[PDB]
Structures are given as C-alpha cells and as structure tokens.
Design a protein around this nucleic acid. Sequence first.
RNA 1: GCUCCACACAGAUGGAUACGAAUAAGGCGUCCUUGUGGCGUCGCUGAACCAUAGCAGGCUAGCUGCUGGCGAAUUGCAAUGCGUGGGGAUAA
RNA 2: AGAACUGGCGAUGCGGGAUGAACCGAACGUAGAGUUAAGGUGCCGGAAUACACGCUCAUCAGA
Lengths: 170, 134, 197, 106, 69
Amino acid sequence: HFKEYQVIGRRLPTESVPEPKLFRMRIFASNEVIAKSRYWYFLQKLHKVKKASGEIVSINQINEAHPTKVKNFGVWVRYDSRSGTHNMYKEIRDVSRVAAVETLYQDMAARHRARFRSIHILKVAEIEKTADVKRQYVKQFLTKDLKFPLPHRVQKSTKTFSYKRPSTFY
Amino acid sequence: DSIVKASNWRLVEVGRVVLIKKGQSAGKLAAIVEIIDQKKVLIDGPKAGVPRQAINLGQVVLTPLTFALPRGARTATVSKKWAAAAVCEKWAASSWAKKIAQRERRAALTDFERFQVMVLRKQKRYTVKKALAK
Amino acid sequence: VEPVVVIDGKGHLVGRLASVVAKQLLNGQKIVVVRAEELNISGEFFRNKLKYHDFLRKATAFNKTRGPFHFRAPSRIFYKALRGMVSHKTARGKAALERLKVFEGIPPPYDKKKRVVVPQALRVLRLKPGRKYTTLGKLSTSVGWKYEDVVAKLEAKRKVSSAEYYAKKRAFTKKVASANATAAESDVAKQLAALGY
Amino acid sequence: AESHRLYVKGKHLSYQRSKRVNNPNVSLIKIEGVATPQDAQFYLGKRIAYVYRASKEVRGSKIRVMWGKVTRTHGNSGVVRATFRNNLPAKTFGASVRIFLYPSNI
Amino acid sequence: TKVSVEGVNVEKFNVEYFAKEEIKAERVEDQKVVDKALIAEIKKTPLLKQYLSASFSLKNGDKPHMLKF
RNA sequence: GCUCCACACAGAUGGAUACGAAUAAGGCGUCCUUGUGGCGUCGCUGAACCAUAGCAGGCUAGCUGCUGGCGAAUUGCAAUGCGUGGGGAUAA
RNA sequence: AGAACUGGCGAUGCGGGAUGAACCGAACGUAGAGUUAAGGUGCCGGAAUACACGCUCAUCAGA
C-alpha cells in the first residue's frame, strides 16, 4: 500500500549562495524513508547533485481531498525497460490519487514487467469534463444508468464437503 | 407465441442494495452508489453505519431489492431515498433476512432455553403426528 | 462426521477431487467415490487422450508383462491419480487405499444411500466458463474400457427405479409441509419461533 | 439417552515435523467443526484422552487410556499441538481422540 | 441461569464437615432441610425441575467454542 | 462337512440424513390453455433436517403427549468405566 | 589462455535447494520453552484449495 509525500530540497546553502531554488515534487511511496530515497534518485536525473550535497527541507503527507467521490485520473508515466526508456499515458477511474497510482503499479507489473525502481510517476491529473477521456475502457462506465450482472459467482466454501451441488446464480 | 424465458439475474446498478459478507461492516446493508469498474463498486449505507468506500464485489453479495437513486449520490441524498423507499421494512419482510435473524437467534440461546426448545419440539411433534395417518 | 462419505464424481476434476480424497484417507476417513466414469478433467479431449497414450507406450522392456499396467476402467484411471499421493507403500498408505472404493456408476448397496460433493473440485466452480474439458467416459472408451455402454444403459435404469421413488417421497413431504403449515400458528408453535424453530 | 458425550471428538493427524525430521513429543490434532486459530483458542489447555481396546485385562477393564493436554494452535486450519504423558503410538495417525471440557475457562 | 439462594442456610457446613476419620443420619437430615428450602424456588420458573433432572451432553453439531452456556 | 469325548476365549460411541439434469440457469407449490405454458415462491451454505429428559438411563400410579409417586450418596475435589486332539460314521 | 587480488571447500556437521564438491541459510556441550532464517503452505509434506488486482489455451502449456 502507498501514501503521497511532498518533498523539498535545496543543495545545502554555501557562502555567497544564500537560500537556493527549492525543488518541489510529489512522491508516491509506502513509507517516509522510501520517499526520501526516491527523491534523491529523481534529483540526480534532473540535474547534477548528490545525497551529501543536499538536504531534505520538509517531507509532509498529502491526504486526498474527497475520498468519497469517484474520479477519472489521467496519469503520465516514464519507465525503464529491456530496451531504452519511453514515455506513456494511461487512464484510471478511481476514488483517490493514492488508490489510482496503486492500481497503476499493479497494471504496469502485469503488462510490462516494470517494478517500482523502473517507474517514474511524471504527473497525476484529474479529468473533470467528459469527452477528454481518450481511452475506451474508462469511457465504458460513463454511459447513463449502467446496469450489468456478475454471473457465475464463485462461492467460497469453508468446509470441504458440500451436500447440495452448488448452483451459481446471482 | 414467442416464449423466450428467462435468465433472471441480480444486476449491479446505481441504487442496488447489497449485503456485506467480509469486512468490518459484516452483515450490514449498503447501496451501490457508483460502479468503478468490472470488479469494484462504491457503496454506502448511512443508516446501518457502514462508511463510504471502494469495495471489491467478492467481498459483497447482492440482494433482490433495489431503489431509484442518482449516479454518484452523496451520503445525505442516499439517506433520503433510503427512507423514502423504506428498504429496511422490505428487507426484514423477506424470507432471507428471517434466515439470518434465525441463525443469530439460535446462536445466542441459553442452555436452559435450548432445553425449552427440546420440550416444546416433543409437544409439537405429538400434534403433527396426530394430524397424519388419517 | 459420518463413517462413510460416498462422493459423486459426476462433474469433478480427477486431480483436485483425488487430492482431497487422499487427505481424507490418511486421516482415517473412509470414502467411496461413485459415478466414476462421469468424472471430469481439464483441457480438450485429444489432450487427455495423449497425456495418456504416452502413459500407454510405457511398458517394460524385456518383459512388458511386468511393467506399468495400464488400467482402462475409469474407476481405476482415477484410483491411480490417487494412489499417486499416498506413499502407497509404507503401511500408513496401504492402510489408506484400504479405505477407498471407486465404483463406475453407482451400484448397491450405495444407490439407496445419500451422497455428496467436494465443492472444491467442480468443473462448475473452478473452470472458467466455456473452456475445453474432458469427461473420462469418452477418454476411457477411446482407450479400451469395454462397458461404457452397460453402465450407460444399466444406469438410466437406476435413475428410473429412483425418480419414481422421489415422487413418492416428494409427494410425502408435500403433506408434512402442510401438516405443519396448518398445525402451525397455534401456540406451542409461536413460542418456538421466538427462541428460533 | 443416546449422547453421554462430554467431549469434542477430533482426529490425531501426525507428529510435529519438517520434511525429514519428526518430533514425536508434540502431536497434531484436528478437532471437529474448528476452522480457525481463533476458534481453537477455546480448546487450549483442555485435557485430551486417546481411548482404545487392548488384549489383556488390566484393572477389570480391557480398555486403556492415554491422557494429555492441548498446548497451542498449529497453522490457520484449527489443527492443534498436543503433548501427552506417554507419546501417541504413531500407528494412530488418523485415529479418534477425545478432547474434554475441563479445565474450563467458561 | 441463576436461582434464588438467600432462603438457604448454608453456613452450618465448611471444610471440617467433610471428614471421614453406612451413610450417617446427620448427613441425610442436612440434605433434606436444605433441599426443601431450595425446591420451593425451583417450582417458580417453568421446566427448571425437569432441567435439573436431565443430563448434559454434546450432540452432533454442538461446537463448544460457539456455545453460550 | 456331521457326531462323540477332553480342553481353550489403521481405530464403533446420536443418525451414510437415496430425484435427475442445468449452472448465461435451476428447485418447490398452484392454475390448467398440457405447454421450452402462466401465476406464486426459494437459494446468498449441513449454522439444516430427523433424533435428543429417565441407575450408561430404574422401580410403581393415573389422565418424556400430560400429570405423579420413589430410589441415587461413602466412587469421598480430576485419573475412558468363537479354535484345538484325538476317536466314529460318510463325501471326496 | 595467462597474471594479480579476496573468499568458499580443505581439517566442517546442521536447515533448505526432489537428489549433489562449488547454490541459499547457518560455524555444533547436554536438554526444556519460545521466536525466526533460507525455503515453502493442492496432496505425497509440517504449514492459507488465504485474501486482492490483472494476464495467459498451448496437437505432448507453463512452473
């Protein structure tokens, strides 16, 4: 499970260099220490620094605004592979920012074999107005009054012997 | 005449009342607010006490009952239509909620109260066996 | 929980069933699988027909008569699938297998007696809808077993003799449902309901 | 009239073991109707008896008993660890074992 | 299931009462005096007399980790 | 095998508690227009059903269906409580 | 192929890898109880026919 963290760093202020530029970015991680570790890895890709040269100024959690409202998250992702790295855009219908990025990591593992170290999360943004939904499978649920069954239900028997011959209606 | 029947199902829909099997809620009614995908639905039951959450449909079983409710309806709006349709009365009137209540009632019998059941079942047997073979 | 636990293969999966039947023995739990022939496997037919013949070409060199004896009869076809998970050598085993009895069809003196099913081994509860899946029956036939017919017929007969029964019974419990339905409501009743009954 | 049963009946499965080593001191007991470790927590500390016929009559009875205790749970199934005074014979792997209701927590 | 007990005079007998150094008449008299002062309260609730005469047993399906006594 | 003599004595603990077929479908009940028919109703586990009270389960009186009349101890605060070795007769 | 460097075996059992000189864990007085490693929990086999998201039909899949 994940959490969203707001990390800021400024390559420790030296003589005649007072209060540097403060690079702000939002990190998804399981805990605080991993969030810090991932932050240093991104700083070294965007520019030339090291862990010793800089300082974590502030690391704070970002709770999701309305975790009772279903949203449409359009996520941009850069990721490493067997070949050279390449950009990507996917769309996830979910509740929170944190649950959206979670299901993205599972999907990226499933379809591309990319682990947490391989994946950079570029930018997560909502899609407020419909018809901006570029993917079919997200647009799929956006039709008026969607009523579908879940047929052939697998009912878990705790006991090993049943006496009825299970009839899987719904 | 064209007789094509039936394939009668419990459809997942905005305003379908559900019964939760697994979780902290456990045996408490909620309504499907909005479908998320194939596997996940967003549920809430303000009267039962179950909070608003994303849930897998493996965690929850559907019920035959439904009511009219708008897509993505909020907790207060759910409560209004819940009381208007009166689904708690519609729930308890069924043979289904009666079975769950019967399991719960039998589960919390005293040893002496169980003895009472035994004695009365001897009496009821006698009246029934009298009615037969006539 | 029942000295004997007659099972009904009809709509099961060699492997899973087996397995679960295995454990049940090694833990002193007499068993009796029936309708064997109407068992089930997974994957097209042409499959199980191979993943077998191979098991057929087996045989020992110098003396084919002392090697892997290829039993055709389903009951057996399945009995193997089982003796395969049961040390079937150390006395602890022998002791098991000694607790089994896989019949093809449903001969007395079980016919007349309840049966059951291992909900954790049903084609209809494990195999993703519409997906190839054998049926032993044919499979056996295709490779020897010379009786699929007998049982077949000699079967339908059993279903009759019964079906007829049920009726009598069903027609019986139709009364009770009434006897109580009426004798219901009264007092003595009310009370029970309260406590739950 | 029929039931004089003041014990929950459960089968004696095996000894506590790895793949290649078995400790015969600790026996594993399946108990009837017990599905979880949480249900098995009730049976912890209750006295067990393995009851069996013998050939020779010892004390005006042809029947002898080995007594023991449930010690703790074993895995997620409600299978339970059990130490007797004299260990169970290993011939009894899959034999009925009587688990009593003393000493009572309830 | 609790009964009324306050009518009974129990305090006569203690640990020393159960010493053994054919049944003594003193023990029989202590039995009857107490039991009559108890029988009176058993008759109040229905089926309680019949309940005490019966014997407890675990039937098939009785799981004591579930059972409320 | 029959007869005559002599001897020997792998895990029960309330109940395996009988439709078949289908599972994108099925039971059960009712009306009959006898049907791939209509109406009603059930499932979401056997957590059920049936059995279940008495010295390990007695002795007696009436109207465990209902009402009775007696006995239980001292077991002391737990230790479950059907072959041989010879005869005779007759089948092989 | 050769040179240099640090370990492993050599003088070394034990748990695991189906089985093993080179792998994984772990350096051993005799026991009792508890907790774990590596490796596993369909059954043989002690331990979830666990929960959750997806993907895969193979005419000898795959592990």
